[PDB]
Design a binder for this molecule. Sequence first.
Ligand SMILES: CCCCC/C=C\C/C=C\C/C=C\C/C=C\CCCC(=O)O[C@H](COC(=O)CCCCCCCCCCCCCCCCC)COP(=O)(O)O[C@H]1[C@H](O)[C@@H](O)[C@H](OP(=O)(O)O)[C@@H](O)[C@H]1O
Length: 401
Amino acid sequence: IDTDDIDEDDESGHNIILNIISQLRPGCDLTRITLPTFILEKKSMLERVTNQLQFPEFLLQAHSEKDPLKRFLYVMKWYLAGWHIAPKAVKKPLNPVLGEYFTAYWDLPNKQQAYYISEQTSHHPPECAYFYMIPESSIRVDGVVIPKSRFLGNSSAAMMDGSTVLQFLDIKDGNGKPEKYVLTQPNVYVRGILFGKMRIELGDHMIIKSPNFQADIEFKTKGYVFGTYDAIEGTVKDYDGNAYYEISGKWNDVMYLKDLKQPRSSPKVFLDTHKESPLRPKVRPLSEQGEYESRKLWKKVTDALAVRNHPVATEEKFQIEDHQRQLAKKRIEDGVEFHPKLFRRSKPGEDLDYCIYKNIPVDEDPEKQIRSILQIAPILPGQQFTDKFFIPAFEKIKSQK
Ligand SMILES: CCCCC/C=C\C/C=C\C/C=C\C/C=C\CCCC(=O)O[C@H](COC(=O)CCCCCCCCCCCCCCCCC)COP(=O)(O)O[C@H]1[C@H](O)[C@@H](O)[C@H](OP(=O)(O)O)[C@@H](O)[C@H]1O
C-alpha cells in the first residue's frame, strides 16, 4: 500500500500526540503548533487542492449542458466528486511555506488542457489562493483555502472559511456577466484522538449558489448512540423558494437525487464514487522547478515519508521551518513585509481575498488566453523562469500603464 493509506499511529505515536495535548488548553490554535510527521501525507496543501479537480469531465458536461437546472446538478456533481480523493489514513497535507507555489496541468480526453496555479499567500494565519482554467472550454475557477485549526478536546477541527468561484465565460446572465457559481467548503473534524481510534469527519453546511439556483448541503455528523459516518443531505431550490431535488447518501460512497415533483418515487443514483475514474494532474520534472516550488522544496521530506523514516523526515521538515523563521526575522529587521508573487489583494465587492494578478479578458480568444496564463508561471515542460516571476504581484500590476 501507499504510505498515504497506512495508519502509522501506534503506541509510540499516540504517546507523542497525547503529550502535546497535555500542554494544550481547549480552544487552542493548532496553527502555531508543530505536529509529528507520521500524520503527514506526501503533499503540500497547494497540491492537495488539485485532488478536488480530478473530475473535469463532470465540469465539461456542465458547461455543455443547455438546461439551467441540469447544468447546476452537473456543477454540484463535479464539486462533490473530489472530496473522496484523499488519503485513506488520518493524515494531513504539509503546511506550505510563505510564498510557496505549485503549478500543474491536465491533458483532457477531449485533447484540451487545464492549467493550475497556486501560491501560499499567508502563513500567520495560513492561507492560499489557486487559479484554474480550461480556456478552450471557457471554464474558469478561482478559489482560496483558509484553514482555522482548533483543539477542542476529544475533537480537533479545521474550520474551512475558503471558497471557490466557478465561471462559464461564454454563458451570460441577466447582467451580461459570465454565469457564476460560488461554492463553500465544509469543516474537517478529527474524532477519537484521546480515547479510541482516530477518524476524519466532514461536518456542517456546504453552500452552492448560482444565478438561478441554490443548494444548502449538510454534511451530517455521527453521534455516540449512532449512526453512520459520511452522510449528506440537502435541497436544490430556485430563489422563489421552490424545491426541485433532494441530495442524499454518502460523500465517500454513493449519492442519490430524489425528484420532489414525484413525492412517491425513490431517490435515484446521482454520483457513484466507485464508478468514474479520477484524472491526476501532470507536473514538470524536478529539474525544471524552483527552490520554493512545492514538490522540489519538500522533496527530502516526502522521500523520507515514502519509506517511513520519520527521524529524517522531521529533520528535513525542521530545516525548512527554521529557515522560514529566519527569513521572517530578517523581514522585520529590514522593515519589510511579504507580498505574493502571483496573486493580488481583493478589490471592494469581490468574492475572494486573492485573485490571479494576470488580466484575462472574458471574451478574448482562448489561444491568447493560454498565452497570458503561460506568462504567469512555468507550467508546461520546457517553460523557463524569468525575473518578472519573483517580482511582487502588486508591482507587476503597477506596471501595465
Ligand atoms: C491535536 C493533534 C491532532 C492530530 C491529528 C492529525 C492529523 C489529522 C489529519 C487531518 C486534518 C483533520 C482535521 C483538522 C484538525 C486539526 C489539526 C490541524 C492540523 C494543523 O493545524 O497542522 C498545523 C499546520 O496548519 C495546517 O496544516 C492547517 C491545514 C489543515 C489541514 C486539514 C485540511 C485537510 C482537508 C483539505 C481539503 C482541501 C479543500 C479543497 C477546497 C476545494 C477546492 C476546489 C501544524 O502542522 P505542521 O507541523 O505541519 O505545521 C507547522 C509549520 O510547518 C511550521 O512552519 C510552523 O512554524 P512557525 O509557526 O514557527 O512558522 C509550525 O508552527 C506549524 O504551523
